[PDB]
Amino acid sequence: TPPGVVMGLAWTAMGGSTLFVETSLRRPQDKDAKGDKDGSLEVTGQLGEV
C-alpha cells in the first residue's frame, strides 16, 4: 500500500471483500503559488448523491 492506497474491508452483497481504496492527486496543485483555490474532488466509482 504505497501512500494514497490502502486495503479497506467492504461488506459486499454476499460476503465481504478487501477493496483497495485508491487516492491520488489528479491535476497539479500548483495552479498558482498565490492561488487560494480549493482542491475540488472529482469522485468516481458510481457516485451516489448522498
Q: Which residues bind other proteins (CB under 8 A)?
A: 24-28, 30-31, 42
- Residue holding cell 448522498? 50
Beta carbon of residue 7, minimum distance to other proteins (angstroms, whole number): 21
Q: Return the number of the residue (18 or 27) whose C-beta is nearest other proteins.
A: 27
Q: Return the number of the residue (36 or 42) whose C-beta is nearest other proteins.
A: 42
Q: What is d(CA 31, CA 50) in angstroms, rounded to the nearest whole number?
A: 29
Identity of residue 25: L
Q: Return the number of the residue (15 or 26) whose C-beta is nearest other proteins.
A: 26
- Which of 46, 4, 6 has its CA nearest to residue 25? 4
